[model samples]
Target: MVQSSVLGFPRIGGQRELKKITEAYWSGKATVEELLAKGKELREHNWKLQQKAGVDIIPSNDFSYYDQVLDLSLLFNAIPERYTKFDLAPIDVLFAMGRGLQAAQAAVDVTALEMVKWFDSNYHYVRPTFSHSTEFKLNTAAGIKPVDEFNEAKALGVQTRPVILGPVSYLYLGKADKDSLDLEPISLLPKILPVYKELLQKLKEAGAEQVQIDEPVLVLDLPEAVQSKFKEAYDALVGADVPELILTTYFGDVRPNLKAIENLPVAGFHFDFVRVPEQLDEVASILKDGQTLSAGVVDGRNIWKTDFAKASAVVQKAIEKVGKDKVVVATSSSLLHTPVDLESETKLDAVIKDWFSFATQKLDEVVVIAKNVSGEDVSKQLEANAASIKARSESSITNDPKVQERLTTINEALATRKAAFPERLTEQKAKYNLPLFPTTTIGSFPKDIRINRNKFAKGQITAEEYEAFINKEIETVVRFQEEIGLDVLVHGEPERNDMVQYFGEQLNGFAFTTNGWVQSYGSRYVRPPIIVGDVSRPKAMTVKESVYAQSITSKPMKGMLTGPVTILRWSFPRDDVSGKIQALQLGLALRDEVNDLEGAGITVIQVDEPAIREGLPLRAGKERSDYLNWAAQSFRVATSGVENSTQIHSHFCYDPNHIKALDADVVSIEEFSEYPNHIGLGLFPSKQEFVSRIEEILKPASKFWVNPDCGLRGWPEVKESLTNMVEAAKEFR
Candidate 1:
């Protein structure tokens, strides 16, 4: 049988019930039982959909109350020693550990371990920390997921493939305590394998027939010792104690580690064709009799419909290897990154509906592929899928010919400045009227109850109505800034759900997911639009509001824009093109917006390139500089189109110093948002420290401006966050 399987599923409830319910529980509006009931309802709903779609091995423990990595931490009781000493109950302790405990002074504090992206995906994970000498423990007794899910599926008479993040990758992705990395994590593999052995033993006892341990880090360049550690990790894992096991990797090419996995003793091995379809040749030579292979033939990173003809063609070769029983159909990675359902969307233009498939619809794609690959007819579903596939391929909405023509006309004038920085700086300073110290904000104010309720109420506002509402909001926001004694003003993005999503909605060549949400931090979720082609602004994205805000206030209204690279990095972009290319297209579209804003008597446009630091390629060689080159070019391409008298500002956060080398005039970093400690709560620095920190970073060309990272919408009161910033005129004690 060409069995159907999905690695995992999104944990946040279909309509984002988990978010509401969890918050409700925290707010004392609901009980643990209520939250649990809601979670079960969503999980079972997801399971039934997959089963109806004909999935063979429905996965359990694929859902998370918070994050999977956080779950693992709770399961193992890996709470930092300080947190473990607290007197809270188990569930409270777990939640507290993931976020942090409030100190007596009411300040929420903890390192909260570390959070980073899950490989190349926008989805983030809670990375754990350990001392190199840490020991492993069999603590599944406290974690209910594996056994509870298995039992839940059994009650429904539906068996499943249990999935767990492999220990090797867990430890590999985790960091040792700051001072304790005397040996890399791979050296701890000897102790880690025992924990896996016990975990598999417990899962098998719980009636799980097959186990999938995902070590996606293998797709990365393995440390010299990790290749051998894999041999140790899996050889012992599958030696005699484990049930049928499948080792999986995804997100990028696994060809680099092909030699390491060519002869593992696991029951099966799966790799992502979504990312590395070219590895077919390398994989073909490794297949032998009696081996099982799962062919990932669907688009894991995109919302496009499955190309059945193309997918089946690839799966047929694998089916030819060990016959039908040896082949399983699956997605390249988990469908967690995709949205829940298209069924709930009644607002998006119906014409564009054919272009997207949320996780629920993609479930249908996997099942039909399994049935079709095993020689069954799926004529009805296939027809619908093909039509969706066809409409998207031929959609005129995806292209704009004028944008392509504009791309060809770029000259030296578009790419670089003719007059250089010192000349532009003098003009900007005179126009804005500033002292040595200046006051400003990053952009945006706290989203109040009225704003959130107004947008959510049914039929309360049309898109046109919302625009008018935003303009009014911008008017008051500008007035508020002038009243607060701020030097630069921003048209507080009162209506934007996210910095990137707001602009992507107005531009061409993009599509949004109804629930294609990913957690940012705490309760925040971002729905990033996918850039499909040459992007050009059909109309003004932010100019009217910015210009209106400027007209309403005397303070310099800094025209706010989420920069091209930040927009591309934060979104689930297309695989058909390089991000650099997409960023360039976005830059050109914004060039017109910038010109329009300056043309409308608005000066001091602040283009925020915040996500660039995270998008900095993990490796720190020439690739980093190459990315900076393209990043700065895109920023220049957009902002340089403005006049010298118009001040073009940029901002970054977490670490804004990354842009010191870039030629942005008046760049700001996030030092005040949270009371940062690396430099102390004192202030930016003394003249000497200021030079070492940022001012010396200024070349003779550009004049530097200071402020916090990006948006201030989440900052409560918005005064303290800015006060810390405004007082940065003098360096710290």
Candidate 2:
């Protein structure tokens, strides 16, 4: 019978218990043992959920304290040399590599791996460093986590498939830290394959039957050298001492290499039907060779209802080629990137929620695909699934006529700048008098429980009541900032749940999912609204709020809003329209808001484009240029409505340092517990690196606002982790 299986599961608990505890441990309020206990408890809770959902061959070794890549870096002894020299405990060393360790009045200095976009996803991974002169040895402590995770799952009576990053993808994502290295990092296959082999042998000894080694770089334009490494690496790992190794590839098609790896002795191969739908034919050929094809027919990236008719056809094709036993139905990729569950959100509009499936609902989709093609008797849940899918397709909430009309009438003004920054800056300075080194924050006040609970209970508070609450929040924040001598003031963003989500809710074209949450480091969750149609603002989105705050504050208050491209990039935008078109539509609506705010006497506007880092494609050429062209246009359009005297400012939380480096002056970044932005110029760099980043950013303006990324709301402690950032920011002085 065909069975539903998952490659990896989300590790955060239902209530975000792991996030709270991890923050506590980082602050020294909780011990490592306490932290470990939390980790285990969360993992146990997660595994049991999947088991109850009837997931077959549940994945092990998928849990991580920070990132899975870093866990692998330690396990495979791939950490850069600088970390080895630290005189600290291994755990301290590990945590230090992720975030700097602190003592009384002293802190260890260690730069982080260059972080980059994880392919097409918004998730960030710490890159492994490569060097000219390199050696390989598995660090025993780092090495054991995976095997231990495997054993723990085994102890729980679940036969498991342990997942790992394949050598080719691992080295391909890494870079040579020192320029002297003539070899591409992927060229280190000879050294890394052995460590892979050694670990597989131990897993075999421990009686694990299957392992999943993922090679995702196959989707990219492979350098001939990388293609060669793939052949060599798999040749060595095809029949390691481990009983079986499934060579898994996802997020894109890899059928191009099927000729070489098709006959390998690996257990099975998984292909992404969601991304590389055309790769199905080639996948069928592999199955024709008596290979077990792990069919990835479910939507892993978006929250759309699973198309069973489309999926059943693909699974049926696999079944026809490989037989029932030889076909395994699974998620196209790990559900870790999607929201946890659908049942937890009762307040979501029933019609809209019916059309979507977060990670947890997607699990049921996996089961449905398997049950249908296998001709199994598990049709009990199929009626509910069918009904949910039907309501969403017909829901008025998903499609808005008013929003579509606005999208159709986009003018050239939506894509052009009114004037350059220099022309605008002169007028802006004359309007809002400020100190030389102005201090302000990226907006977001405390989501105080008492307040949220009341809002939740009342459910029908009048608009005026809501404004009073938000205005009070702004007043309190403004008063505190004045006491601290801040030059610029902010409204403190109490009205925004998620910056993008807030705007999406107000805009006509967007529909939100209750369970459409995605993990943004630790337990912090974001429910990105889905853009299903054209966008238009019905009324002034933020003019009243901004104007009220400005009237009460003596300091110049910046009107905070998320930018067009950022809103488009962060959300599961409608696949029917081009992202650029949707972005332009959002920009036009935002332009209206900017004009309205300025009309209300707001002098400064800070539009945040944090998710601009994500919309960029993996391949950079004409594609990258085209993206920036539209992306920058979206920002300009959103800011264009205001007068030159009304300053147009912006902030980017996820800095993309490697590519077309930014040149915005009034830019704030997410410097919250992140540095060595090693790929692009970091916010806080080494004295030398800092000099370099500052030079790149400063050339655009004589003097402008600069600060770390954002607030410390999600941090472990309110004081040290949040307080010490001022010293790092003070370096600019």
Candidate 3:
């Protein structure tokens, strides 16, 4: 029988109920018990929906209170003593590890664990901290949650499969403490294998027929040390008295790594047939008799609706090669990256609306393809899919003459400065010349409480009152910068929710959502505005804030704006337009904003492009080169209207290559001590050490600025961090 499966589903409810309740729990407005109850409710609802959709393989253990990676850390007892010391409820400890608990009554003040990107996606995971003293035991702490969730669904009479991050990939993604900086996490495989075996066995006993062991690292260029251990790890679980293991890899090609596991003892294999379908012919040839293959034919990354006729062809190819009984039709990757359902997008344009599908609808796509391939009656669904594909292809909404006209007029001159960096530097130096090391902070101070925003949006707080509050907050940041004696100041973007999402709210070709939240990091979610049509700026954005802050301060206040590439990369962009076209649309919009800021006496405009490198294709080739060319050009066009002495600054948290590419006057590079963002670890930078770090930048670039790694908004010990920051700059001066 052909099994129609989903790797995972979006945890955020259709209306983003998880985000609402989780945030409430963090603010002490809701109890941990209430939060857990809501989490359980969401999980139950998600399971029933998937089961009802005719999904043969429903997944459990995918619902996370924070991040799935953090769930793995707690399961393995990989948490640092700092988190466990809080002595709150287990879920509270989990939340503390995610959100960082700071209670004056409890006398607990700690920052959350470090968060990094989950592969190339926008979703973030808490980086697991490991050391030589790390112990791997079969404890039921975080380890048993999967088994518990598995059994929870079993009790509900819905037989479901459990998911676990594979041992090698789990260790590969973690970090080591200073005590064991040289300790390879892969070296701990011996200790980690037993716990996995234990969980597999427990799940087996609990009646889970199969386990999805995700090893996405198989798609990457693996080291020999890591590659050698793949056999060792699986060899240990060959007959561990557990459920069948379905080895899965996604995002890219895994053919190169499959040689090691071609004849491995795992019961089945799952490959991302959507990303690298060329491997299908060869992979089927290698599969041993009776071994099954989960053919992930449906794309799980993008929001585009599936063409069932096309998907059926992929499934038919797999069945012909491997036989239908030996194949399972599934999603290319987890549905966590997509929105919950297309039905919630009531605000979207009707013409192009059918072109998109979210997580919930993707499950239906999986089932429809499975049934169609199995020679069943799904002609209605197949016809519906065909109509959607046709409508999207021929939709008049996708073809915008204004966008076409703008593209034809774009020239090399639009993407280059009127003068080179040297000439611009001389003019900028003459304008502001007092500092040995110019200093400024990244855009944004702490936002007002979320509850306040909810109240304001709900008409509880008047618009005038909200504006009054923001004005006062801006005044506070201005005074703080003046007292610290920094050369440049920012308006402190307290008025914004996120860097990219803020501008999306004001733009013309986008749709906003109240509950469209997706995970960016642990407990940090972004409600990405979906691009629906031709993007245009109706009027100037960010000018009022920048102009007001400048009027309040005599010092040079930098006008903050999200760069074109960053805006395009960060938002859920329209797939109908090319990236270059979409980026240019944003660039032209930003050009208008930049010119307005300059006209408003905002000489120093900081257009932040933190996602420039992040937006690159994972593998290096024409795809990577072409993307960089357009992205860099889009950024240049966004700032070209400004004068030589306008001092256009761009903030980056990664890739200094973009710095040279942008030819910024005063490049801001986020640096830390020997550790990974130690300042973010709640370890304040010493004046002597911070000065030495600042000196490192002075040697490379003559005109540069020193600042914290990134925004300090919502972080603990803000006053102390800023005090140390001022002292460090003073010493450097």
Candidate 4:
């Protein structure tokens, strides 16, 4: 029988229990023992969830208190020196590395390690920091967690496969510490392999039958040194006393890195057939006779219900190439990026609810495929899936004539600024200027305490009381901006829950949930709304807040809006429609928001499209270019309605490649870069080198505004860091 496997499951519990418990501990509301107990409960529940769905090979240790990579960092004793000063418990030390430590008992406070995007997804990882002087060692006790998780599943009578991040990718994903500028992490792999060998040996001794070692970086183009290092690392790992090793790679095709695994000693190779199906024939031919092939046929990153017949054909092709015993059907990637379950969505329109599947439902689909391949009776499941797919195809709910007409009517003018940056900046400066380099914050303030500040108004507090509380908060926020000497001001997004969720709640064609939380990064969870139909704004989303803040202060207040492409990418969008169509509908919706803010006398409007670069296709060609065109066009149409003096600004948290791709008056980098004429928040002095490099090639009248790259909440070093950042900006002036 062909077995079914899951690469990983969502760490957040069905009700976001982990998020609540972990945050409670962070806020001193829960004890360490309580946090640990909740983690155990969540892990056991997840293992049983997959087991109940008939997953033959469930995964263990994929559950993370923070991130899997960061966990590995601790297991290997690769922690940096800054985080060691807290005298914290071993677990709190790990938390300190992820979220910084600032207890009164500590000698000095420390900011968290750099959090970077994970392989183009919205999820982030704690980047490993090291120096040339760094050494590697296996913490004998730390190796116990993976084996313990495996045993926990064993106690439930489930044979689970444990997961680990491969060593090559771990180092590749790391960065050299500030002191060791020129050192590459690849050079440290020789010292790191011993730790992996120790951990694998322990898992084997604990009665593991198989291990899933994920090396997702195999999809990226590798240099000669890194490619050679893959051989050295895997060669040592294969020598470990672990059970069967299934080398897995996801996100894109591994054709370029095929040579790295051509003669490797491993039990199987898992390929993401959803993203790179054309490589199936070549990969099948290359595997040795005794090896196994885990065909990842189900889409894990998307939310569409699986088309049973099509997936069955893919599995049949794999089984024909490799024997049924050697094939294991699985998801294309981890389901952590997806919501927990679809059964909880009781309020979705009946017509479209059947067309959607969350992480829990996808497990059932995985089992159905395995059964179909095994020649079992799956008639009922297949019938249900086909009917839902057919219903979604023929339903008028998927097609709105107005949305289609709006797409057709959006012309070149709608995607272009009426004036170029030079003229636009001049007008903007004349309208609101008095500084060499103006300073301001991104948009959000600390949201931890303030996020639920207005929630009592849900029922407990009267409307008048809630309004008064919000008014006082806004007044105080504006006063702080003025005291800090910021040139531009913001209302500080306290009334909002999330940048995407806030807008989704105020718009039509969206369905929300009380517990649809998915992990964003670390313990941070976001409950993304589901976009069910044509998107349209019901009213002005941010106008009231921006107008009120502007009314309280003489400085320019920025009108904040999440961009079209971002809102679409972040939501569980309608699968029946094209991404381009959904993006355009969102663009039209936000276009109206921009016009309303401008009508409210808001001088500056910022529509953030941080996910634009992430939305690009992994492979470069026609599809990539086409995605870029529409994604960029969507952003343009959303912000093009404002006047030249309105100062349309956009902010990027990641490297957006070039500022010229945007049609706004200003491009804001979250932290340190020296791109010319572009505004940047000088997060640290190290990032300032780019500013100097940019000056050598600077435009004659380039405009640069300085501020912290992003929001100020949750960062413990807000005052010290922001003060230092302001001091750095003064140097450029």
Candidate 5:
């Protein structure tokens, strides 16, 4: 019989209980013992939930206090020197690496390790920083997370398959620390394999029958040296007293990297058929005798209910290639990308609600697909899934004649600026008359708890009271900026909750959930709104705030808006529509917002597209070019409606090379270490440290702006940081 498997499950609790307890612990409101107890409870709940769902192969060690990759870094003792110097506990050390530690009493002040996107997904993982003094050994101080999690499940009468990041991918996904810039992370793989061998031995001893070794990087373009190391690492790991390993790859096609995994002695392989179904035949053909092929048929990254017919067909094809016993139905990737449960969305429309599935529901999807493939009676499940799919296709909410008409009107003319940057820059400079190193921020101030209480929690305050509070907050921010003598100012977005969700709420064709939260990073959770239908702005979104902000300030106030590509990428978009169409539709809507902000006498406008880099295709090719084209076009359509002197500014978090394609007058790429042209170099945290750094940067660049790396929404030292930032710029000028 074919078996059902889930690669991983969402660790954040159904109502975000983990987030609340973990944050409370961070704030000293809860004890360490309390935090650990809650973690154990959440883990036990996940295992029991999957067990109850009739899942054959449940996974352990998928839960993390922060990230799984970062968990491995701590488990393998790959921690940087700065984090370990304080002699902190193992758990505290882990948190320090995930988020910076700054305790005046403890005399510990260290910044966090570099974090990068986990493949193309919005999930971020802490990049392992290797230095010349790096040592590869298991840190037994905390008793190994993966091994402990496996035993934790065993005690619950739930047998489980433990998951670990494969050694090759672990090193490949990391980088050299600043002290050892010349060191290559892949070279450290030989050193870490022994530790991996030890880890596998420990899991086997703990009674783990099979282990899932995730090598998701196989989907990316790999260097020949890196590809060759896969065999060498796995060969050493598969020896004596170790659990049978299932090599797993997801998020993209692994066809190009198939040569690297050839002749590896793994027990099975998992492929994300949901992402690239075309790779199935090729991958199935390569399966060795007695090797299981875990066909990932259910969509793990999305919230849509799985179409059983389509999923079963993929499973049937896999079974035909390799016998039924050799096929295991699974999720496309970790359900970590999805929300916890659909049941928590009590306020969603009933018709639209039936069209969706969260992590818990997806557990049933895998089981149903596996049952149908194994010749079991799953007709009722299949029928219900079919009905949901049909209902979504015929739903009036998904289609709008006006949105279609607007999409038809989109062309090259709508996406191009009136003039080049040189002409626009001259006009902008003449109009604004800013400093050589103009100072500003990334468009959010620290929010008060009262704002959240009024907006989300019951009838605590009236709308008029909320507006008055927001206005007073805005006034305070404007005065703060003016007093600091900064060149440009922002309304300090206190009224907004999230960059994407704020705009999503005001736009048509979007649905929201009260408790749907996904982790962006450590303790930073975002409730991404669902793009239900055709996107259109019902009215002016940010004009009232921008107009009010500009009225009280002599300095240029940036009219803040989340860009089109970001809005589309960050939201749970409709799977039925092509992303290009959804992005274009969003672009048309934001074009109106930009023009509205300009019409309201807001000369400077910022449309942030921080997710653009993460949205790029994992492998560079026509697919990547196609994405770039549409992404850039979407951004252009949003900002091009404004005049040259309007100074259309755009912001990005990583990889600034693509900024030129958008053609914004000024672009602020999020970087503390480093740029040229009209760009903002985000200042480091320390006031004194960034002052010397500012002097170095001001020497070479002709057009430069100074600002923080990202928004100051939850930052603790906003006043001191911005004040020092302005002082540093003035010293350079």
Candidate 6:
């Protein structure tokens, strides 16, 4: 019989229980013992759910207090010197590396390790920093997380396949620390493989029959040195006295790196048929006679209900080539990128609810698909899935005639700026008459607790009462900016909850959930809205707040809005529509808002497209270029409606190399040490240190902006940081 497997499950509980308890421990309200007990309960609950759903091959050690990659970093003793100096506990060290820890009483102060996107997904992972002094040994004090969790599940009468990050991919995803900038990360793979072999041997002793070693970097463009290390690393790993290993790859097709793994002596290979189904024919032909083929047919990153007919066809094709006993159906990737459960969304429409599925529902999907492929009686499931898929396609809610007609009318002229950057810069300089290094913020101050209290009060408070409170908060922010001697000001965004969800709530064809939360980073959770159909703005989203903020200050107040591509990329979009079409529709909607902000005398508008680089396809080719074209066009369509004097600013967190394609007048990038064009430079409150860094930045670039690197949404030292930033800019002037 065919088996069903899951790559991983979401760690956050159905109603955000993990988020609440984890944060409570961080804030000193809960003890470490309490936090550990909650984690055990959540893991037990997740394992029982998968076992009850009749999944043949469930996964363990996929649960994380923070991130899986970071967990591996701690287990292997790859920690940097700065984090280890604190002499903290194992869990405290983990939290300090994920987010900076500052304890005056304990004499512990260290910045966090650099975090990067986890393979084009919104989830960020703490990048392991390697140095010349790095030692490779198992930190037995904290105990092995994967081995412990595997035994915990065994004690509960649930047999699970334990997962680990492959040594080659773990080093490939890391970077060299600041002290050893000349070191190549891949060069350290030889030392790390011995540690990996030791961990696998322990898992075999713990009664684990099969192990899933994830090497997701196989889907990326690899260097020659990195590709060769895969064979060398796996040869040593499979030679150990370990359980049978299943090599897994996901998020894209792995054919480009097929030569590197064809001869490996692993027990099986998993391919993501949901992302690129065309890889089936080639991959199935290369399967060894006794090796199993895990066909990942169900979509794990999205929320749409799986189409039973289409998923079964892919499974049937794999069975035809490799036989039914050699086929195991699974999710395309870890369900960590998706929400926990659809049943928790009590307020969603019933019709729309039937068309979607969350992580819990996806478990049943893989089981049903495996049963149908194995010649079992699963006709009832197949018919219900087919009906949901058909209902979504034929519904009037998904198809808007007016939205389609509007998309047809968009042309190149609409996406073109009224004037080029040089002319617009000159006009903006004459209008504002600013300093050499203008001081501003990345649009959002720290959130106030009372605003959340008022929001949750639900119909008890009047609209005027809420508006008056928000107005007071904006006035205080404007006065604070003027008092700090800053040039540009922001409204502090006290009225908005999230950058994406704020605009999504006011837009048409978007649905929301009260309890659907996904982890973005350490203790930071965001509720991404669902794009149900064609997107359009009903009225003005940010005009009232922008107008109110501008009225309170003479300085240039930035009209903050999330851009088109970001809104589309961050939300769970409709699978039926192409991203290009959905982005274009959002572009048209935001265009009206930008023009409205300009008309209301808020000429300096900052439309944030931080997810632009995140939206790029993993493999670089025609597909990448096609995405860049439409993404840039969507941004232009939003900001091109204003005049030349109306300055357009966009923010990027990862790569700013794509800025030239977007054609914004000014772009504020994230890194302070890398590119020197229009950055928020310093983090310290010391004037001497800030001036020294400013002098170094001035050597390369002509124009610069002095501000914080990103928004100060949760920061407590905003006043001191901005004050030092302004004083540093004044020294330059």
lDDT of each: 0.71, 0.70, 0.79, 0.80, 0.86, 0.86
**What count of clashes does model 4 give?**
5
The TM-score, computed over Cα atoms with residue i paired to residue i, of candidate 5 is 0.91
What TM-score does structure 4 among the candidates reach?
Answer: 0.86
lDDT of 6 by residue, 1-733 (tens): 7899999999999878888899999999999999999999999999999999999999999999888899999999888877877678988888888888887755766888888889988899999889999998898889889999999999999999999999989998999989999999888988998899899999999999899999999999987767788779888988548989999999998888888888888999999998889999999888887999999988888889999899999999999998988999999988888899999887998999999989999999999998898889999998988999999998887888898999998898898887777677787878988778888888767635565556657867677877888888899889988999889888988877777988889998799987667788866777889998988887888899889999988899999988889999899888888999999999999999999999999999998887887888999899998999899999988988899889888776664446766777667766434432344543435788888887876664446877777777334578878888888888887
Instruction: Judge candidate 2 against the unseen true structure and give its global Cα lDDT, from 0 to 1.
Output: 0.70
- Error at 370, model 3, angstroms: 1.2
Please estimate how well model 4 matches the true structure, expressed as its whole-model Cα lDDT.
Answer: 0.80
Residues 1-733, model 5: lDDT tens digits: 7899999998989878888898998999999999999999999999999999999999999999888899998888898878877778999999998889997755757888887888888788999888888997998868888888999899999999999999888888899888899999898877898899999999999999899999998999988878888889888888669999999999999999998997899998999998899999999998899999999988888888888998899989998898988999999999998999999887987998998899999999898888888888988888888988999988888989999998888888898888877788788888988877888888766636555555645767777777778789899889978987878889977777677888898899999987778888877877888988899998899899889999997889999888888898898878888889999999999998889889889879888887787788899899999999898899989988888888888777664456777877777766422332487867746666778887776565557788888777334487778878887777777
CA lDDT of 675 in candidate 4?
A: 36
Error of 5 at 322 (Å): 1.9
- Residue-level lDDT tens digits of model 1 in 305-344: 6777778878887777557888888888887777677777
**Native-vs-model 1 lDDT?**
0.71
Clashes of each: 2, 5, 2, 5, 0, 0
**Each model's TM-score?**
0.86, 0.78, 0.87, 0.86, 0.91, 0.92
**Ranking of all predicted structures according to TM-score, beginning with the best and ending with the worst:** 6, 5, 3, 4, 1, 2
- For model 5, state the Cα shift of residue 731 in Å: 9.2
Output the worst ten-in-a-row residue range by lDDT, candidate 1: 674-683
Alpha carbon deviation, residue 80, candidate 4 (Å)? 3.3
**Worst ten in a row by lDDT for model 3:** 674-683
lDDT of 2 by residue, 536-571 (tens): 888888887788788886788888888888888888
Model 2 regions more than 4 Å off: 28-34, 80-89, 105-116, 130-135, 139-143, 176-184, 255-265, 282-288, 318-325, 377-384, 417-498, 508-517, 522-535, 549-558, 572-582, 620-733
What count of clashes does model 6 give? 0
